């Protein structure tokens, strides 16, 4: 129920996925759930990151330079090797005789516990790790040391910089070392980026009731402190090791702040810390769930409590950073920060708004490296990055090289232009469901209006008014040009021209509603009456292409191109998630079929629903029969292959508002199991899949459990399926907080101040702390 628990030894990248799952983080950091007693093999990899930390490789390949932007796997603080009787204590898959690892959801504590075979007899080596949540530079570790036998034990507690970025297979070709080790000092390694100018340094100081610890010399890059004790037989020996870790990214003076913080500390400190903040975390962010899958109760607090370690107000208030989508659990696509963010924010905003705050001040911080960005494309206004780093200057790659013949060719990755959307979208979102609009005034409401200034710049009007958006990409990642042409991009993709129409329209009512922060923000963005009146012809004007039957073309063209074969893909290859590389080894190019690689067009709904969809398009004047919910999301299913974690939600949420419980439920449990399950091996071992974390949260609170906060007002329609016997959590909105119980048959909901909702469409007046149910 509480407890994310592992029986037995893995290898390889079942092994890594297990680490990625048991991580533990605070906003500030991440640290892996690898074993304390090993260092990177094939089986082990430890990992310990800090918000926003990057640096910068080099690496020649085929006569050009290619620059990486890596997020840092720090040096290694807990590495432990033992020695009994001046023998290294070997430990490996042909020693340890039992290994169960777990992190305990209820108190944020992950524990392992090992029996090692060893020539006098048996080791016991139970290990209890934690970070504090408050004092977020700390991290605490206990180990637990009995043998059935008496000997000398030497305990080597160490801090590791011989270490590299490692944890992606992938990307071992290049550059992997990230820091020059720059002094060890007593408790203290100092570590600097090569090219980011970013000192790290990592402390840690390790005790014991039983043996003292001393600073000893050891191997070049690594600071160690070494003890020595009696091991009596059967009787346990406790060691803990504290650490603190700071960067001068954050902090002015990380040397002295490391320095003091060790000496002020202690790892019991740590696991209360930790024990007291998850325990007030759950009153409010359990989310209950009854119902006949025996591990989906699990899950759900799986996916909670690795979104909130992935970024939490306490920490995050002091930092300049936002979440990965991998948090700070891998390695897995560097750390950047992708349009993923659309998967989270919507959560922190319903459930700990400070949080999504902080969040989204990342974004506003680089608004002006967006307009870099723009200039050196030859657009305007702020055009956001497809990965963003430390800088929020353009961190894919803009050439690939063709692994069949040696040679460049473009990538067209950056065209996902709608990333610039989903920002502005997260800004709204945070602000119709709490309220703050001092985020707009303190830089959101410029990053719209100079977003906008990007669509309105790039929209080319046709001789009958109408207007369009060409050269980018959609979600469907498989789609990133016409056939028949080397130029990047498509045109009128319709989730990029239905979200920039819902964002015109956003803009209108801000310029009405918010009028005196409006006509301050226009003024010192030049947006002016010719940029506002293109804003409104714009938002009436953009292209969409419809079909006779009602089915809205992916972008213009679309249904000109060739079908697949999907079920004979299936049965030659197996597995047709990676179609697009199938295609792409037998000669083919995807650009020149319909398949999806996730939904594009039904992203829309995902992001706004149907209601608002629709409204969308009847406001660029295109008509659409009264079905064509079922009518889309059929033709699209018929087309995608899934080769998204965060694809099958997509569909889960339309299923639920069609009324097709069966498959909704199906596609949501494939869902939330994807990192838990690891049927297809190692899927988790680059890090957790944060997106579909919340995604599948949004298709368990919002579509199932029927609760939406954006459009203005609470609208609760709960469409429970019959198998779930009781769901209930809370919500925040607007400083007001809600809680629901719902079962197939009714829905309570009660606030703590008064409010004016509505239940299945109806009006309803909420009194404060006095429940209703509606059945």
Do not use: C
Request: without cysteine; proline residues 3%; aromatic residues 10%.
């Amino acid at each position: 129920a509480w407890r994310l628990m592992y029986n037995g030894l893995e290898t390889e990248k079942r092994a890594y996925g297990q680490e990625s799952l048991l991580t533990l983080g605070n906003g500030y950091v991440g640290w892996r759930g690898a074993s304390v007693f090993q260092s990177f093999d094939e089986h082990n990899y430890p990992g310990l990151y800090v918000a926003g930390v990057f640096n910068q490789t080099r690496t020649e390949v085929a006569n050009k330079d290619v620059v990486n932007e890596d997020m840092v796997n720090l040096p290694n603080p807990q590495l432990f090797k033992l020695t009994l009787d001046d023998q290294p204590v070997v430990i490996n898959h042909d020693t340890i005789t039992h290994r169960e690892a777990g992190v305990d959801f209820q108190n944020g504590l992950f524990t392992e516990e090992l029996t090692v075979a060893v020539p006098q007899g048996q080791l016991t080596l139970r290990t209890v790790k934690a970070v504090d949540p408050k004092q977020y530079h700390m991290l605490g570790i206990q180990l637990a040391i009995t043998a059935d036998f008496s000997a000398q034990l030497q305990v080597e507690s160490i801090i590791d910089g011989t270490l590299l970025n490692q944890n992606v297979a992938r990307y071992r070709a290049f550059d992997s070392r990230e820091f020059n080790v720059t002094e060890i000092a007593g408790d203290i390694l100092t570590a600097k980026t090569r090219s980011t100018d970013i000192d790290i340094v990592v402390g840690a100081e390790t005790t014991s009731d039983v043996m003292t610890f001393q600073n000893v010399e050891g191997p070049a890059d690594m600071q160690v402190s070494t003890g020595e004790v009696t091991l009596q037989t059967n009787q346990t020996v406790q060691i803990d090791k504290l650490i603190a870790i700071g960067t001068s990214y954050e902090l002015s003076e990380p040397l002295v702040f490391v320095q003091a913080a060790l000496a002020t500390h202690s790892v019991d400190k740590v696991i209360e810390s930790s024990t007291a903040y998850w325990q007030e975390v759950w009153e409010t962010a359990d989310i209950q769930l009854d119902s006949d899958d025996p591990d989906m109760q699990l899950m759900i607090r799986m996916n909670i409590f690795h979104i909130r370690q992935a970024a939490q107000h306490e920490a995050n208030k002091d930092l300049d950073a936002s979440v990965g989508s991998r948090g700070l659990t891998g390695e897995g696509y560097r750390g950047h920060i992708f349009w993923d963010e659309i998967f989270v924010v919507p959560y922190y905003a319903a459930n700990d708004p400070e949080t999504a705050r902080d969040i989204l001040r990342y974004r506003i911080k680089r608004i002006d490296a967006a307009k870099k960005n723009a200039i050196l494309d030859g657009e305007a206004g702020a055009m956001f990055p497809w990965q963003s780093g430390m800088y929020g200057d353009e961190q894919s790659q803009f050439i690939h090289l063709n692994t069949v013949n040696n040679e460049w060719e473009p990538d067209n990755s950056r065209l996902q232009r709608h990333v610039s959307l989903t920002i502005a979208y997260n800004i709204w979102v945070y602000t119709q469901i709490t309220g703050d609009t001092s985020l707009l005034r303190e830089g959101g409401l410029e990053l719209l209006l100079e977003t906008t200034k990007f669509w309105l710049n790039k929209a080319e009007e046709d001789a009958d008014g109408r207007y369009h958006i060409a050269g980018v990409m959609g979600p469907d990642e498989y789609h990133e040009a016409y056939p028949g042409t080397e130029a990047g991009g498509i045109k009128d993709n319709a989730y990029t021209n239905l979200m920039l129409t819902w964002s015109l329209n956003w803009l209108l009512e801000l310029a009405e509603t918010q009028t005196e922060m409006f006509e301050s923000v226009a003024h010192e963005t030049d947006f002016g009456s010719d940029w506002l009146n293109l804003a409104k012809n714009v938002s009436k004007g953009l292209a969409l292409e419809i079909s006779p039957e009602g089915i809205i073309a992916q972008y213009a063209g679309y249904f000109d191109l060739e079908a697949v074969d999907f079920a004979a893909y299936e049965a030659k290859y197996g597995d047709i998630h990676r179609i697009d590389r199938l295609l792409k080894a037998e000669g083919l190019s995807p650009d020149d079929y319909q398949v999806a690689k996730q939904a594009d067009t039904l992203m829309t709904i995902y992001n706004l629903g149907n209601r608002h969809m629709a409204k969308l398009v009847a406001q660029l004047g295109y008509d659409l029969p009264e079905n064509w919910l079922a009518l889309n999301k059929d033709y699209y299913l018929a087309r995608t292959v899934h080769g998204s974690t965060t694809s099958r939600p997509v569909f889960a949420g339309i299923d639920v508002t069609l009324n097709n419980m069966d498959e909704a439920l199906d596609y949501l449990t494939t869902a939330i199991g994807s990192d838990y399950y690891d049927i297809q091996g190692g899927t988790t071992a680059e890090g957790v899949h944060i997106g579909v974390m919340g995604e599948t949260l949004e298709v368990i609170q919002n579509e199932f459990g029927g609760v939406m906060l954006r459009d203005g007002l609470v609208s609760i329609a709960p469409n429970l399926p019959t198998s779930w016997h009781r769901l209930a959590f809370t919500q925040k909105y607007r400083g007001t907080m809600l809680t629901f119980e719902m079962t197939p048959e009714a829905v309570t909901v009660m606030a703590d101040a008064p409010l004016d909702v509505e239940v299945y469409g109806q009006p309803v007046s909420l009194a404060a702390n006095t429940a209703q149910t509606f059945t």
